[PDB]
């Protein structure tokens, strides 16, 4: 969610808060990258498990 990723209420109305919004949006790209890394490596396990059980 926007709360779970820290992008709830990004405020861009000045250089300082707009840089704090850039930091949060890049950290959120890094959080979603690491979550999709877990789901990627996990689907690697299951394509191997299906190749094994079959």
């Amino acid at each position: 969610s926007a709360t779970g990723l820290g992008v709830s209420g990004l405020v861009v109305s000045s250089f300082s808060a707009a840089g704090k919004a850039m930091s949060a949006a890049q950290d959120a790209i890094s959080y979603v990258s690491s979550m999709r890394s877990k789901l990627g490596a996990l689907q690697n396990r299951l394509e191997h498990t299906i190749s094994n059980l079959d």
């Binding site: 250089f15 707009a18 840089g19 704090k20 850039m22 930091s23 890049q26």
Partner: protein
């Protein structure tokens, strides 16, 4: 007769100062201080635009 033009021209300098704008902000009235450009991908990669009163 010189003073007529030396007063009208000095009024024109202050008309340039309060009238010239970018995106509706005054540039050369002296209130364009500490106005950061953001010139890269990360939080706070600034260049500062500063202009004295003209």
């Amino acid at each position: 007769a010189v003073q007529q033009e030396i007063n009208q021209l000095a009024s024109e300098i202050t008309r340039i100062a309060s009238t010239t704008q970018f995106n509706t902000m005054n540039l050369i009235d002296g209130n364009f201080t500490s106005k950061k450009l953001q010139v890269g991908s990360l939080c706070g990669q600034a260049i500062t635009i500063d202009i004295s009163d003209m």
